[PDB]
């Protein structure tokens, strides 16, 4: 007997036990006489079109692949639940938080950002940590990262950032000129680059990392009073990281290290959990916060904004079929039940558009009817009809226009959004030159010890050495602005690497 | 109170009765506060992206349309059952025919050929009569016409024939030059052109027409003995046709006459039925038949091949949602359970390829999981996986390769096809100059009376008058070959029409 | 010799003249030996898969259809040019208007709203009049109607409105209960319903109707000063309408009357033109306008806002292939060159999202590379890459991220949009009960004469008679509010029709 | 200065030189004022829908990914030419071979089989070597492997084989139980498994490997006389292989080793070439060949069937954009000009169906209009029309039906295929138990030396150790049948590995 992942098929055979083999059928349920040989004109003659068994099977095989996710392509999934452990009903009317001990089913997908489908798990990258909550007020998708921040603060740059992080358009190779030209020109990236190149850039599987909502959200209570919040989900298995050397070894030996680790943990009963916290900031505190509190390159310091415990995420179930439950899952940040709303974080606003949009491409217009995406603890009743691969009854003969005088679904006034006044011109405002160094300096100095600063600078120099000198110089300039020692230590290591380079 | 079709919504309201209106939700089940107004910056300001209710709804609306069927676009559907009334188990082992009184659920779609989605029902055209039988040996699709024959005997010409029957590629108009140039050059069309331009070219709705399989099929019994057959399903409501004048009036007043007539009949309990017959021909009779018995331009005369009664089709149920059940239905002639097989009819062989192929385009690779297409009285178990819009469980964790040593589905030797030896070179054989007049002459002379011959010639001349003279001459030449009176009477009427034309 | 439309193929043959027939090829350019017969095992044997000529052709035929447009499905197209005839450079910096005599190529598509692909042209409906201007500042799409107004003033209701105007979801029939329930509940529709049921509801082909932008747009001049405007394009062939009786006759005799009329006019040199006008309103006038000047249910009265002449549209070219140039054309109201901008018309704002969104579905992500959609008088240079059916060079090896230090395209500050301040809360504002009768009354009383009022009431009653009584009563109530005579005359005719109804 | 691949962007900048930066535009060519910041209601307010620059860019980014190839996903491409160096016109009338010195442009894609898009190049796998020849008789696609044989001899098993070679459906991991269960049950795999696990299983980049057509093809000369042939294209850079240890190191250090190696070779002028040979067998020799000569698990021994030189493939051009030219390229084995035909190799027959079928999914129905797929040295003239993303003119107003009397393209009798008679029943014939060991034994004994046999057995045992014991036993049984030493040496190493396993 091996690890549970290696025994997948043996275990499936054993559950079947004395049951006779099912009859092998075509797509349309017609029994198949022989699926080992094709129909031919005698033993050395050509193939006949009336071999429809062959064509049915081959045509399906031809269309097995769907587009990979534009980002976060390489993933591992699991199911379990969220349990409420404290009352936060003062902050939010959301039914997910309604009373202590209320259990909500969840789906999670862990992912890297830049690697395509086949790529190694144990590489330096931000990790996605997406959580779908199947609530009675429909699904809530909290589509998180393993970092509280991101590289950019304006959503128009996200395609550019991803292009720089992927392959050269001509050579189809990873290109450090591209990666570091983009970062050196966008120094709002310094904060997330510092975290990325620290130890937690390569977690030891998905079980040993935190997740964050990263954005500011707005919570609204039953009285219509609003606060801003951050979501944090801190690992109960404890933070653990791979060394660069072990990460490299695993990249070759086990490209799917993350998938295997998580599948095995759940199959052997070692159920990974995370404690779900909020930080809360009031609307008055948001006016007086030294930075933009909706700036995705900034954290809220813990002293001023302590973590308020809410609940626990537990993963206790493996996906039965990976394609059905993990390839096809779709998380939309716009799927927010009443009591949770978008802040004016520019980056979050961009994400409200982008995700349904890509889901309709990658999966299809009716992707929300795919069972993993279905809000199966709500009744969906609306005026949407038709579209390819329309499943169930398409809401039967119900009137398909609103308003109507025929008792078809009605809007629910309690579900109406929180109202705010905003001051200023409707125009494009420049954020680039915000305050991109202050909190990065706090991280370098007050969070990292001396050993960690040394590895941070060795990890940066090891990547940045492959850029052209003019890029290296602009990169080092930005690191210098964070802290003289940060810049100088990077420059020192680059001088060594550029001298060894013939 | 009006006809049942006009009272669709009132009846739906009444069934709901005292029930409170459902809550109006987004696609993801989140309740909607207000779906009458969009979120704006003050009363005369611009629209916000965080209006996701608006974007969810609009984006769905944008993708409501799917490709129309390449042919047979305009359709009406119904459900009911097939009941066996006689034993034909001597001819076929098919479970659909297994014992007297065995009921099988059916789905039917009636259609014209050339009209696009919006077009009028009451036009001169062949009518489709497609029947899906949901058997325990999977679905059987008998994809029939309202005529026993077709215009062509080789499947390579089918796209050409349809192009000639549709719109000019530049003008986007119906083009009689195109229609009649194609027919005048392909005189195998004479038989189906004669039927088309007779009275039964415009049936009085779908209830007053026969359906035919048209092709020769091969029936195989439990001993492995094969016969050839034709399927006929003769209307129990009796044949009835619209006059050209009434057809024209209805085309303007009620473009959806066929849909309305059938929906109303079923809603008022007047359940239309058809008696299902076979003609049988043995393999020896097929050797000695004066024509090719697999020639789709030929009938089997009733004296030599009498109709053997089998069962009854009854339509007793309206579709609940037209898009779900009629737009999305897909019939594949290749879906044949054991005991029914393809003959070597060249046209049928072509159809075994074409239909799954177009279904994967029009609907999607997993179109057989759409509930109307699902073989819900069989267990589907196979090695097909994934593909966009994968529904249910994708067969769970079952081994996905065959052969395997893990008890995954097994081929069933009893379902193996009937074996035949064929003599000759593998090459392209010319059929054009077969015997394209003999059975047409039998129809003109022995089936039609004098009144019917006169209308046939008036109906042809009325269409053919719009072709160029050289086309008219080649058309009349082919009609002359059927019978001198056929050609002469057409020429006479054309001379009148061409003189009135300035 | 017939009309030019009827002689399409003869003319094509004649242009070819002495040229030998091209060689018939597969999709991949391989010459075809015989495309009249399929490869079979002897003359009465089955079809072989190695007949790839057959499968290549059939598979293409299977995928000929694309989704029809969700609205405006049935269309006729033409090409020509726009010529500037007056200086409006004081109002707009747009290069389309740059100097007198400047010619810009155009594409136009005329359409009904509700009819599907096959449907009759000569029916009562609003007509689309879409104009694509191929300018040197890229394409400008002015996607107009044959009416200055529309039925609704908030874009969230557009899917609902279209559903009510199309087929019942169960019966698949047109449903007057649906049509009039929606209008009776949304009395902002009264203005467009009055125009629709007047004489200009059924124009005599596309040449005898006006087009309007309908929305308020914002013009910006080279000094950065903004005005609001309306676009009007008035027919130079003069307004002409079909009677209800002639419309009905043509619906049966010539379903494609509009397509034929326009194709023939252009082929015989009778080039239809429209005079292109603007109305201008200043930002101060917009503050003091008695209604919302961005309300799509309102006109700007001509006395207060006179038509300023700008140029002339001339259509002088037929599409060479209808599918290439008319089915595949895509117009995006968001395609506005510098100097033309969106107003805060809520309906226009909705349209900025919806059209690219549906185009990516109907045509594909790279639909702007389809030659009719290509901005062929601009160089397209951007950071967009890949996507299915990527044509040309995908911008070669150019850096694909922005900002970059490698001389890839740069933003152009002169193209930056006009800035405005807006006052108010970000919330959903109710518009329903605006002023929905005042301008309708002006139309009924001051524009229509007595004969026209009588036909208006006969046309309404003739449609509305088929609704249930409670709907009829709410409809008449809203007409009464416009004018007592309007309501009373409709009620009188309904009493007659409801008495004749058994 | 680095390798040319690393200097891609610097070289692109330098070619541009003094040229001013292009203007950054939308998709529709409208100039962009600012693409660094989004439009917001004041500096901390929400995002507006009228930011169409943002939505245009984001929506495109959302749809960048297309489905990866179902097999051979990970690829490197290049262009160059084929030159004829000897006369083979006695064997084939194909215009590619027409006279000595005739140059034909080519496109090549090298690939692994099982790895997805992101995966490492330097892994043990068969390599694809696909060649598209752009001839004047259209494109010829010779879609080859780096081995003369394959694992299976019947095309119905190809989906099963690929499933076993890819990821477990539940765990999404590579599964040795799956790999070796399939091979141990299908011992026709022994020949290709022996080659795969020898040294040439991991070539040193794409330049140091042979390509083979693998199938028997049929050549037809101008007199209509047919022979059978194999195509071989032997590397002129010489065979060179990576050790298992170096392959593992490169898999981690340079996942894209193959892409980089080939791009650099071509950019530095070191143009890789292959000598193109045929083996010829006459129809009489095919009757007397000891095996099935159309059996894809068999070679033709070189003594009996010597290599006849034909020409040279030279690769001298890098793709300008990888997505345009390598992701979107499509090779169809069915694209054969006159003079080259399919043999009755069952596996080739299957491939005639599968490839166009998958191309229409992965790329689109009009994928042959993508410039890399376009047969640009032939005029394509046919009756195919429409389909999504129809480019060029859709063949203008040419008649779209055949036959016609309007001078539209005509079939070319010289292009008609070679005719053969075949003897036997049309049924499913069992091939499994053919002669699966004889030629494998010849390879083990006569081709491999002692060192190579030892590595072969170490390479097999190193993979097969991870299977369950019952699979290991059935695998070893099949290896024993090839040669007692083959089986015994594998069993010995497995006993060592299974003892170390706790």
Residue numbers in the entry:
A (entry chain A), B (entry chain A), C (entry chain A), D (entry chain A): 4 to 505
From the primary publication:
We determined eleven structures, with three having four identical molecular subunits, three having twelve identical subunits, and one structure each having 1, 5, 6, 24, and 60 subunits. When compared to the range of atomic structures determined by cryoEM in the PDB in recent years, we can therefore conclude that the system overall works well for nearly all specimens amenable to single-particle cryoEM. The resolutions were all sufficient to build accurate atomic models (2.6–4.5 Å), and a majority of the structures (7 of 11) extended to beyond physical Nyquist resolution, indicating the power and importance of combined detector and optical performance.
Two of the others were essentially at Nyquist resolution (catalase and glutamine synthetase at 3.4 Å), with only PaaZ and the 70S ribosome at 0.9 Nyquist.
